[PDB]
């Protein structure tokens, strides 16, 4: 029942290979719905989920103007940050930004976010009060002063509490059949001998949405945290996600082991064992 919207911006310089690329994507939860790429043959905001397509040409042109302006703004920001760090004109650098709003199950604003990074390190973030900044170093302090002068925190607060929430709610309604539908994992346990005296038990979760899940193995009812090989949750490509967790167990202590599965889509949490 909890929902969020986020935009993710990536700006990458590439000296000797033209002007910096800017690409923006937008998400509601684990569903991407828009993209803009300054490298595209004809740069424009494009729909990436069916329920966004019903938005009119004024929506698309408003997004495109915003993202075109950002392309220019980030190119200057890249110049500026190069200078703040005394860096040579030879290397490629990346600024990233992620911002958006979280709603609780009642649809009210839980909190807002706006964070930026430079070469993958935290650079500047809006504090949870939506009024003040945390700057990582003396370079970021310069940005902080520029941002205070343009009343940025104030503008973000108005957006995060207003437009962000309102549009997130709109999308959740327009896309309710998917965005507000949790699909439970399909699960099973596999067994493969690794040797005479040990076997792998692998607990699979497939076809679930949203991506948040917990898979654990227990031996005699206690967690096997250090003994579990856990794979990153991965996209199937059809909106759903996949994950597995594995333990190497002594033969035949298999029945002492249980896989536990927690997901929003499930009527009740699952306990599974290998079923020979």
């Amino acid at each position: 029942g909890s929902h969020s919207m986020r935009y993710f911006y990536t700006a990458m310089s590439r000296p000797g290979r033209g002007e910096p690329r800017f690409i923006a994507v937008g998400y509601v939860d684990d569903t991407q719905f828009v993209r803009f790429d300054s490298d595209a043959a004809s740069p424009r905001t494009e729909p990436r989920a069916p329920w966004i397509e019903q938005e009119g040409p004024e929506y698309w042109d408003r997004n495109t103007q915003i993202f075109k302006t950002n392309t220019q703004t980030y190119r200057e920001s890249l110049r500026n940050l190069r200078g703040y760090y005394n860096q040579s004109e030879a290397g490629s650098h990346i600024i990233q930004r992620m911002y958006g709003c979280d709603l609780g199950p009642d649809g009210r604003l839980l909190r807002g976010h706006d964070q930026s990074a430079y070469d993958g390190k935290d650079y500047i973030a809006l504090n949870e009060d939506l009024s003040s900044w945390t700057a990582a170093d003396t370079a970021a302090q310069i940005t902080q002063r520029k941002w205070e002068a343009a009343r940025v925190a104030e503008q973000l607060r108005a957006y995060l509490e207003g437009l962000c929430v309102e549009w997130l709610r709109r999308y959740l309604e327009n896309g309710k059949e998917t965005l507000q539908r949790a699909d439970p994992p399909k699960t099973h346990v596999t067994h493969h001998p690794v040797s005479d005296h040990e076997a792998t038990l692998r607990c699979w979760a497939l076809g679930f949405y949203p991506a948040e899940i917990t898979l654990t193995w227990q031996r005699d009812g206690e967690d096997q945290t250090q003994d579990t090989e856990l794979v990153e949750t991965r996209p199937a490509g059809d909106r759903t996600f996949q994950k597995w967790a594995a333990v190497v167990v002594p033969s035949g202590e298999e029945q002492r082991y249980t896989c536990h599965v927690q997901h929003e889509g499930l009527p009740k949490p699952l306990t599974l064992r290998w079923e020979p």
């Binding site: 994507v25 991965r234 490509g237």
Partner: protein
């Protein structure tokens, strides 16, 4: 610069069954910077019309991408994913394994 090497997973959209159309996925994630080269291989040859997702990143700022193509798995055709990144000495090949 702090750089991060990609994690690589190769797997199918649907459980694999020989002679049934499916999708072969290569998921690369946890990498930085974002430039990366990814090819899907069939018996060592580069597959042509591969598609990929739009560049995004995780809460830790690391990038992720999904590359995919329609394929029909068979008993003896071998599939893999070939990845190059600034952090790698040479391209890394991860083979497609049904139980992984």
């Amino acid at each position: 610069m702090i750089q991060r090497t990609p994690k690589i997973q190769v797997y199918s959209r649907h459980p694999a069954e020989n002679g049934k159309s499916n999708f072969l996925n290569c998921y690369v994630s946890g990498f930085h910077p974002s430039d990366i080269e990814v090819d899907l291989l069939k018996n060592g040859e580069r597959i042509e019309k591969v598609e990929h997702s739009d560049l995004s990143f995780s809460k830790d700022w690391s990038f992720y991408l999904l590359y995919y193509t329609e394929f029909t798995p068979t008993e003896k055709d071998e599939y893999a994913c070939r990845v190059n990144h600034v952090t790698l000495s040479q391209p890394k090949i991860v083979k497609w394994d049904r139980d992984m």
